[PDB]
Design a protein around this ligand. Structure first.
Ligand SMILES: O=C(NO)OCc1ccccc1
Ligand SMILES: [Cl-]
Ligand SMILES: [Cl-]
Ligand SMILES: [Cl-]
Ligand SMILES: [Cl-]
Ligand SMILES: [Cl-]
Ligand SMILES: [Mg+2]
Length: 344
């Protein structure tokens, strides 16, 4: 067990191993930047807030730690360390997580002129990471520019997996928290699957090409109208698949519209980029291109290498259907903290 030291940073006590030095608050869990004397990296350290206050929160803590411990891919966040100052399960109350210190895609999109070559490389990396994530039967659920980290050499990592914690108020009005969401989950039409992430990638790619949000709706209904004007109103095949009669009823109240011509929307873009967007932004989720299929599209010809696009080890999510007490979720979490093995 390493030696820990204590300090108070913006009204929060931080108790961390000596290896982490020069802690500096970055945002409010709370996150601090630090220097890691063991690896020599600048790192981000996140202290979870009230990790075991309720059954829902305790299960959410376990979910985040299980996800981060599994991810071992160049284009996905990796866990450098996880620690607690507690010396036994009985005094266990705090969880700290450590990763490489990150700019996001929001900054470079608003501040830079991106060539088509930049768009190719950035979207290629998102899809390479998504192929890995989806191969473990994980759905991200919350892909958007602020959850994509980018460095000076245009290298990209996916982070901030959806933990099923975003509330209805967080998604209300003219907000980027909703602009990248698939239509079928924005209104809870259906039991969704991994195809919702491909819709988000299409929204991000459009924004890189034009510099503008694709579907900046002022509320849920305005956003649906913007979406259907581009991709067309649904046919009877897709309407069947909508379980709620209430949502089926509302859709049929709308005047029918055909799909627009994407070459006249995305004026001047690479024709291969337009073709890929048409295959991502399909209303019927069964018919969208998958991440593995998209990596083989001709738009990525200068980067695609099928011997260097790896898949993930299997990921057991049976805990998600399990009903446990707070102390039982807490003990499962403690076991995962103490068994952590750092990367090479
Ligand atoms: O991506 C996630 N959770 O899914 O957290 C990001 C993160 C992890 C560790 C330290 C700071 C920030
Ligand atoms: Cl130490
Ligand atoms: Cl503790
Ligand atoms: Cl964003
Ligand atoms: Cl009509
Ligand atoms: Cl597993
Ligand atoms: Mg985020």
């Amino acid at each position: 067990r390493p030696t820990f030291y204590r300090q108070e940073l913006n009204k929060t006590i931080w108790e961390v191993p000596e290896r982490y030095q020069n802690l500096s608050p970055v945002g409010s869990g709370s996150v601090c930047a630090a220097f890691d004397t063991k690896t020599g990296h600048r790192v981000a350290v996140k202290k979870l807030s009230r990790p075991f206050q309720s059954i829902i929160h305790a299960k959410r803590t376990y979910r985040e730690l299980r996800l981060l411990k599994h991810m071992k891919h160049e284009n996905v966040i990796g866990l450098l360390d996880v620690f607690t100052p507690a010396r036994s399960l009985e005094e266990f109350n705090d969880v700290y997580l450590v990763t490489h210190l990150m700019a996001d895609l929001n900054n470079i999109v608003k501040c830079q002129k991106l060539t088509d070559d930049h768009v190719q490389f950035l979207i290629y990396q998102i899809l390479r990471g998504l192929k890995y994530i989806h191969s473990a039967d994980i759905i991200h659920r919350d892909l958007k520019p602020s959850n994509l980290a980018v460095n000076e050499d245009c290298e990209l990592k996916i982070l901030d997996f959806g933990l099923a914690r975003h509330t209805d108020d967080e998604m209300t009005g003219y907000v980027a928290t909703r602009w990248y969401r698939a239509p079928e989950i924005m209104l809870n039409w259906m039991h969704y699957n991994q195809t919702v992430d491909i819709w988000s990638v299409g929204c991000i790619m459009a924004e890189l090409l034009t510099g503008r949000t694709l579907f900046p709706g002022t509320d849920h209904i305005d956003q649906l109208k913007l979406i259907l004007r581009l991709v067309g109103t649904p046919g009877a095949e897709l309407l069947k698949k909508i379980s709620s009669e209430s949502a089926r009823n509302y859709i049929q109240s709308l005047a029918q519209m055909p799909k627009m011509n994407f070459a006249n929307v995305f004026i001047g873009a690479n024709p291969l980029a337009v073709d890929l967007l048409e295959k991502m932004l399909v209303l019927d989720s069964d018919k969208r291109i998958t991440a593995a299929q998209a990596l083989a599209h001709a738009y990525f010809a200068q980067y695609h290498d099928p011997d260097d696009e790896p898949v993930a080890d299997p990921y057991d999510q049976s805990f998600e259907s399990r009903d446990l007490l707070i102390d039982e979720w807490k003990s499962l979490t403690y076991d995962e903290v103490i068994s952590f093995v750092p990367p090479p």
